[PDB]
Amino acid sequence: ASAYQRFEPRAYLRNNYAPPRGDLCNPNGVGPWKLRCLAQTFATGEVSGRTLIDIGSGPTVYQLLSACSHFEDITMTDFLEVNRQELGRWLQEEPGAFNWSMYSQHACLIEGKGECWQDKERQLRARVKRVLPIDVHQPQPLGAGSPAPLPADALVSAFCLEAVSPDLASFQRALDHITTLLRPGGHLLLIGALEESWYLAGEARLTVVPVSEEEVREALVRSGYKVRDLRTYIMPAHLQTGVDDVKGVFFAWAQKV
Amino acid sequence: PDSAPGQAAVASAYQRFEPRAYLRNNYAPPRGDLCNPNGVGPWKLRCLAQTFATGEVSGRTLIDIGSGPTVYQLLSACSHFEDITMTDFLEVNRQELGRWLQEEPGAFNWSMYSQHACLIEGKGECWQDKERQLRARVKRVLPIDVHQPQPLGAGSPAPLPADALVSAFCLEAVSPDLASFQRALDHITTLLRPGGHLLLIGALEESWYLAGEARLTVVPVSEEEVREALVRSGYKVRDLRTYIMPAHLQTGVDDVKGVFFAWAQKVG
Numbered sequence: 017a018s019a020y021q022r023f024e025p026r027a028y029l030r031n032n033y034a035p036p037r038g039d040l041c042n043p044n045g046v047g048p049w050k051l052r053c054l055a056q057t058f059a060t061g062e063v064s065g066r067t068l069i070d071i072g073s074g075p076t077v078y079q080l081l082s083a084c085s086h087f088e089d090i091t092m093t094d095f096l097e098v099n100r101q102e103l104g105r106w107l108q109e110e111p112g113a114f115n116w117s118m119y120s121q122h123a124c125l126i127e128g129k130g131e132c133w134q135d136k137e138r139q140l141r142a143r144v145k146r147v148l149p150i151d152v153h154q155p156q157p158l159g160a161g162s163p164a165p166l167p168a169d170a171l172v173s174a175f176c177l178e179a180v181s182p183d184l185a186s187f188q189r190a191l192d193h194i195t196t197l198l199r200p201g202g203h204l205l206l207i208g209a210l211e212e213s214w215y216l217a218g219e220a221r222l223t224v225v226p227v228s229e230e231e232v233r234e235a236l237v238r239s240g241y242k243v244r245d246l247r248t249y250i251m252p253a254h255l256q257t258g259v260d261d262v263k264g265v266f267f268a269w270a271q272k273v
Numbered sequence: 274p275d276s277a278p279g280q281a282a283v284a285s286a287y288q289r290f291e292p293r294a295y296l297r298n299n300y301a302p303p304r305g306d307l308c309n310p311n312g313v314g315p316w317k318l319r320c321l322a323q324t325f326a327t328g329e330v331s332g333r334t335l336i337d338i339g340s341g342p343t344v345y346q347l348l349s350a351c352s353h354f355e356d357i358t359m360t361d362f363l364e365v366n367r368q369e370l371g372r373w374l375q376e377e378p379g380a381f382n383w384s385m386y387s388q389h390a391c392l393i394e395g396k397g398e399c400w401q402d403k404e405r406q407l408r409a410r411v412k413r414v415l416p417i418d419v420h421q422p423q424p425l426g427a428g429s430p431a432p433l434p435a436d437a438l439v440s441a442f443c444l445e446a447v448s449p450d451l452a453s454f455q456r457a458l459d460h461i462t463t464l465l466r467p468g469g470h471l472l473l474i475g476a477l478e479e480s481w482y483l484a485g486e487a488r489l490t491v492v493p494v495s496e497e498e499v500r501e502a503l504v505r506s507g508y509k510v511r512d513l514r515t516y517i518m519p520a521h522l523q524t525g526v527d528d529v530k531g532v533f534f535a536w537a538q539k540v541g
């Protein structure tokens with residue numbers, strides 16, 4: 017946990033969202049695969065509502081590109097101030113913002129509605145109402161009097177739980193915690209690293225709990241979810257770069273029941 | 274009568290043609306805004322994409338007639354032709370194309386066009402790949418004069434006859450009158466093989482446009498005049514459609530009233 021106090025957003029972004037992993041041209045890559053799961057899921061029309069919360073957003077926005085057109089009130093979160101600052105730089109189009117435009121473009125490409133990427137980013141920026149601090153280790157992760165409309169109609173979280181959880185059991189609790197934020201019948205879209213034990217973010221070296229696809233499913237069932245979909249991306253050799261030891265990436269579509 | 278005087282006026286006027294001002298006037302916003310699907314930019318790209326998407330227009334070689342300093346008109350084309358010849362009257366335009374081919378930063382940025390083409394072609398292609406293909410497939414950039422009976426000169430590089438021709442906003446913009454327009458059409462048609470296709474885009478009812486200092490003269494033509502010329506030159510007209518310029522795209526860089534797109538096949 018206290019390791020997260022060294023966490024460098026720019027080094028994280030660079031490590032995971034710039035070439036090679038950030039090169040979206042090849043459709044067999046992890047970036048396109050992620051955007052596709054996201055896009056395909058929302059395209060079904062079954063994941064809808066007014067409000068949505070992104071859990072442990074970090075400094076990234078790609079996880080909301082296909083989401084923003086289905087929810088008028090979007091709340092983004094993160095534990096670190098430095099990440100919330102970095103999101104704001106993109107939200108307010110301030111100087112030095114990270115360039116997500118390749119991801120926007122690809123989301124537009126994938127969605128196939130002939131939308132221009134500027135419109136997509138415009139809609140996202142407009143629908144994100146707030147960037148709030150959060151701790152999934154807390155039974156009320158957002159806190160007491162959070163500005164966030166609760167309960168949310170849906171949740172999104174990518175690369176968070178397994179990355180803030182020393183082991184399987186804490187992972188499970190953290191899931192139960194955020195689950196309280198979700199209205200019954202609501203939807204959760206969860207993405208994460210498979211069988212990963214560490215990753216770097218500049219001077220920070222974060223520990224990760226290695227989880228498998230079945231472990232992820234069981235955890236979801238335990239937390240009271242019906243698993244609508246659960247898919248795995250195996251990490252090709254050329255995307256194994258020495259910034260971590262992730263073996264695969266999972267995508268889960270779960271419904272609170 | 275005499276063609277030489279009019280043609281000389283034209284050549285003269287174009288010596289003031291500034292590529293940069295022209296690009297700004299026509300391919301930067303508002304006209305270069307590709308977000309509005311009702312805009313002229315997306316209408317053009319859509320016509321070209323839909324046409325190549327029939328699979329009916331293909332082969333080895335393609336010639337773009339009067340390319341100027343633009344490439345958007347080849348974005349959908351380049352996936353169907355291994356060998357592409359670009360062309361223009363002005364050396365300054367040919368250099369402008371030079372900058373883009375070398376992928377120089379000084380060059381004009383067509384990435385919004387490349388992206389929008391990838392977007393409507395619906396193959397999930399990324400724009401960097403499309404641009405890299407176009408650059409690979411452009412085999413030469415040649416001087417051209419559509420008023421000459423051999424527009425490319427004699428014993429020219431271009432593989433002739435070409436399997437298809439593209440031309441956008443050239444003829445009506447270098448032809449002083451309908452008869453000159455018709456002749457220019459006849460000359461370029463000699464470059465197309467029989468059974469080949471011409472894709473033609475141009476201004477409707479326009480008499481002038483601006484390219485910096487240069488305020489140039491244009492023969493205003495109508496859909497029906499365009500159709501008759503194509504028939505006259507020995508084409509079957511496969512498609513001919515018209516875009517009417519919205520008031521807010523009428524910005525005083527020209528007096529264009531609409532844009533036409535013609536798909537025509539040379540009778541053979």
Ligand SMILES: Nc1ncnc2c1ncn2[C@@H]1O[C@H](CSCC[C@H](N)C(=O)O)[C@@H](O)[C@H]1O
Nearest residue numbers: 072073074076095096151152174175176180
């Ligand atoms: N106790 C905690 N509660 C919630 N988030 C935490 C947390 N501790 C660390 N985090 C955040 O978890 C994030 C993991 S990295 C994930 C970033 C982004 N979601 C992506 O898909 O790339 C970090 O930004 C980190 O600050």
Ligand SMILES: Nc1ncnc2c1ncn2[C@@H]1O[C@H](CSCC[C@H](N)C(=O)O)[C@@H](O)[C@H]1O
Nearest residue numbers: 339340341343362363417418419441442447
């Ligand atoms: N006699 C001639 N023969 C062929 N092209 C000529 C010509 N005289 C001028 N041109 C070219 O006609 C062009 C018209 S502007 C069209 C540029 C481009 N095709 C586009 O779509 O924007 C100029 O580039 C100009 O140099």
Ligand SMILES: Nc1nc2ccc(F)cc2[nH]1
Nearest residue numbers: 032037046175209255262
């Ligand atoms: N956190 C995190 N983001 C990623 C993006 C791509 C990838 F292959 C692994 C990743 N881990």
Ligand SMILES: Nc1nc2ccc(F)cc2[nH]1
Nearest residue numbers: 299304313442476529532
């Ligand atoms: N030469 C030229 N290019 C154009 C692009 C759009 C338009 F509306 C008019 C144009 N004229």
